């Protein structure tokens, strides 16, 4: 809801990704914007006529690499200048909203996690309460700059469900999945879409379901890397990074633990704190391979 240059941009609560220009005239005599970030390209969408729109694509958000494309166009082609004038202004509004979004979502995220550290830690063991809490902080002051690879975290990952002690009996693995199983996505989306704006991303409960899915999947097969592979996903299809994980931590949070004894309840409080450490720092992981012994059984 902010102002760009000579005109005030508001975000369409209605649908993600889009926005409203108070003065068309200094939009491109567009009301209506649709913003795009692809790995690393922004894309502009100007809907100018029905069916008809201005493409203006912007290379790794460097504005001298900048293209223009006229769809359906009838009528003469802006000039350049013009265009540029006002990319140039929501360029950096883009930007600054990202930037806000990222450490508007690290925050809530980390209240979640630490949050799930008080809770589980009343069954798991003050241990287990303080590591969760650092892997809280961890989240709380990370930047975007440094979220890792997808081989990169399945190693770390690895290091924990290579460990020993790691087990996960039948009886435990059909409750945990169970568990997902009972969740719906919507309700899920819902409630996530509750922590804040920068929840606010396209197809949640899409992302919700792939959680679920897979994260089923991960219990019966063991096979990790199309959950993580997920995550890295939605950021190379434009959520940040800061928010992808906030938005992962998020579900993971969400989980329903009723119907879980104390040893499921080790599982769960593990894994969830590993995925993300996982993402986030290398060293986390050691700590909590070394809790792993007092948490589970």
Request: proline share 3%; aromatic share 8%.
């Amino acid at each position: 809801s902010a102002k760009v240059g000579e005109i005030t941009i508001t975000p369409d609560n209605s649908k993600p990704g889009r926005y409203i220009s108070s003065n068309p005239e200094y939009s491109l005599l567009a009301k209506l914007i649709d913003a795009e970030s692809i790995k690393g390209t922004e894309v502009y969408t100007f809907h100018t006529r029905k069916g008809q729109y201005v493409k203006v694509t912007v290379p790794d958000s460097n504005i001298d690499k900048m293209r223009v494309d006229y769809v359906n166009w009838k009528g003469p082609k802006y000039n350049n200048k013009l265009v540029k004038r006002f990319v140039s202004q929501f360029l950096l509004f883009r930007k600054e909203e990202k930037e806000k979004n990222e450490k508007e979502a690290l925050l809530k995220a980390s209240e979640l996690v630490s949050g799930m550290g008080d809770k589980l830690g009343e069954y798991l063991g003050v241990k287990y309460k303080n590591v969760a809490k650092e892997v809280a902080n961890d989240i709380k002051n990370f930047h975007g700059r440094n979220i890792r690879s997808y081989n990169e975290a399945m190693a770390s990952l690895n290091k924990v469900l290579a460990n020993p002690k790691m087990k996960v009996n039948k009886s435990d693995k059909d409750a945990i999945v169970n568990a997902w199983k009972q969740v719906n996505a919507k309700d899920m989306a819902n409630k996530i879409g509750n922590l804040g704006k920068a929840f606010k991303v396209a197809d949640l409960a899409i992302k919700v379901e792939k959680i679920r899915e897979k994260s089923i999947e991960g219990y019966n097969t063991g096979n990790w890397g199309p959950l993580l592979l997920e995550v890295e996903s939605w950021i190379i299809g434009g959520v940040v990074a800061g928010v992808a994980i906030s938005l992962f931590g998020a579900v993971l949070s969400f989980l329903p633990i009723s119907g879980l004894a104390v040893t499921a309840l080790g599982v769960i409080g593990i894994m969830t704190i590993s995925y993300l450490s996982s993402f986030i720092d290398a060293n986390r992981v050691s700590n909590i391979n070394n809790i792993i012994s007092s948490v589970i059984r």
